[PDB]
Design goal:
Elements lengths: L4 E10 L2 E10 L3 H20 L6 E7 L7 H19 L6 E4 L2 E6 L14
Antiparallel strand pairs: 1-2, 1-3, 3-5, 4-5
Helix pairs in contact: 1-2
Length: 120
């Protein structure tokens, strides 16, 4: 049945206030883990959309199943998170990878309603 378990720590800062929690994601398919990541990301963004934060920074740390596995597993999971980011509306220029941790930055249309529209 189901595959390996990953622990995902999501840390988001808005208005100088940090919301952080570590989650256990146990899935059978890669696709199941992806939608689980989406649910966790939405969960951390739920009170943050109510705040309408002009800009937020999210750092996500992933637990690797073993030490030797880390290099291949980081790249393997990296595809999983990058696909989730692209499925949620985050750009490649908004995602920065550093080892076992990926930091994604973004803005909400709450306080700042002046969305950057393409030049006409």
């Amino acid at each position: 049945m189901s595959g390996k378990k990953v622990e995902v720590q999501v840390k988001i800062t808005c208005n100088g206030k940090t919301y952080e929690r570590t989650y256990q994601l146990y899935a059978v398919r890669d696709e199941e883990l992806k939608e689980k990541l989406k649910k966790v990301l939405n969960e951390r963004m739920d009170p943050i959309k109510k705040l309408g934060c002009k800009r937020v920074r999210i750092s996500i740390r992933v637990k690797h199943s073993d030490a030797a596995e880390e290099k291949k597993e980081a790249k393997k999971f990296a595809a999983i998170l990058n696909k989730v980011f692209a499925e949620l509306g985050y750009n490649d220029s908004n995602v920065t990878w550093d080892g076992d941790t990926v930091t994604v930055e973004g803005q909400l249309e709450g306080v700042d309603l002046e969305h950057h529209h393409h030049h006409h």
